[PDB]
Design a protein around this ligand. Sequence first.
Ligand SMILES: CCCCCCCCCCCCCC(=O)SCCNC(=O)CCNC(=O)[C@@H](O)C(C)(C)COP(=O)(O)OP(=O)(O)OC[C@H]1O[C@@H](n2cnc3c(N)ncnc32)[C@H](O)[C@@H]1OP(=O)(O)O
Length: 380
Amino acid sequence: RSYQFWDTQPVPKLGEVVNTHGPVEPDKDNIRQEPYTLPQGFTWDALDLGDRGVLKELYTLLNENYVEDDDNMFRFDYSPEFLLWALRPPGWLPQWHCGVRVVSSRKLVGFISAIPANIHIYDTEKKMVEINFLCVHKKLRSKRVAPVLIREITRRVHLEGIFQAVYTAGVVLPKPVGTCRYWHRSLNPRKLIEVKFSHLNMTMQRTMKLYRLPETPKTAGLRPMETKDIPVVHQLLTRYLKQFHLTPVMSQEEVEHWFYPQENIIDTFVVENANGEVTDFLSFYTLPSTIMNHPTHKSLKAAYSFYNVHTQTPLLDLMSDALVLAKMKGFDVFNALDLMENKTFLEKLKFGIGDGNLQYYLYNWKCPSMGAEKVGLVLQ
Ligand SMILES: CCCCCCCCCCCCCC(=O)SCCNC(=O)CCNC(=O)[C@@H](O)C(C)(C)COP(=O)(O)OP(=O)(O)OC[C@H]1O[C@@H](n2cnc3c(N)ncnc32)[C@H](O)[C@@H]1OP(=O)(O)O
């Protein structure tokens, strides 16, 4: 299996064991000043997501052309407000919101993005970027536009003195540093079976009983995160992540951004104990999917496990409360990867394994691969 594009890139070869730690190639001290050439009739445009019209254009591109399931039944439906959250974290740069437009019509037909992130990989902390929202319009697929987008964002990141990146994809490329699986926990099994997200030895009555949850969380002192909690959430997260081999390193400003609750985007609940001390937190983000070509049910409301930190509340209890909270908030399904300590609760809390993998990658960094349990990084 050859990779016309990926074989040219500073990434390790598939099927080869890495015993070392470090960059694949030495840092470039001169970088190409001019954008890479797009096919005729197409032009680069940096997207100002602070402009409502431009943000809506990106929303529409992704709504119509972004990630689908392996059965082409469900497509991610990131909201405009969610995209602002994901794409304008602390240190975001305008040149890193990289759009492709049709010259004549101005139609947005391609996108890729970088956001800055400090990443801890084994014993090294590196300033990197996280690459996300790579998207080529359906009508432009299989025309080698993706490699141009990747090279162009690489160039723009290089200009800023950054030479490593982290990214995830459902497809196998050279070369995963970790392989994860999505698991799903049914909250509204009736709807999930109706739209064929899930299927029914069990009746519908038994299935609804099986997945039924308490109407309120059980953990004493669970409450939404507030401004006063930003420092302790930062403290808790930073200490908790030390045990994994691939993690973000977040400033307090970044913790505020990624965790402070925003309705329909990000939920974070902290446990404040009988002493007034915050000892644990749970978080999940909101990402619905379009139910493709369906006459009645148009959208699937999904919550995604983000970072869950336990020091005094058992993780099992925290996650049980996360499910209850998601149910209360009207979610149809709660999704979680098998990374960090998630395998300790997935089967227990009646999660079912999903189709397809989520591969974790580094660009221009060689290191040994790790088990899912050692991956401590969750991306939007
Ligand atoms: C230091 C700074 C570094 C910064 C950069 C770090 C690297 C970042 C890397 C990007 C991280 C993205 C993270 C996310 O956003 S993952 C989300 C990706 N988006 C989607 O899946 C949405 C719907 N799908 C599409 O829009 C796709 O069909 C895309 C746009 C992905 C491919 O468009 P198209 O189907 O029209 O194909 P092509 O003819 O233009 O090009 C074919 C080449 O593209 C390689 N390909 C296909 N899919 C992916 C993929 N997901 N990551 C990397 N490479 C991918 C493929 O192996 C082949 O190369 P090779 O097999 O010949 O070698």
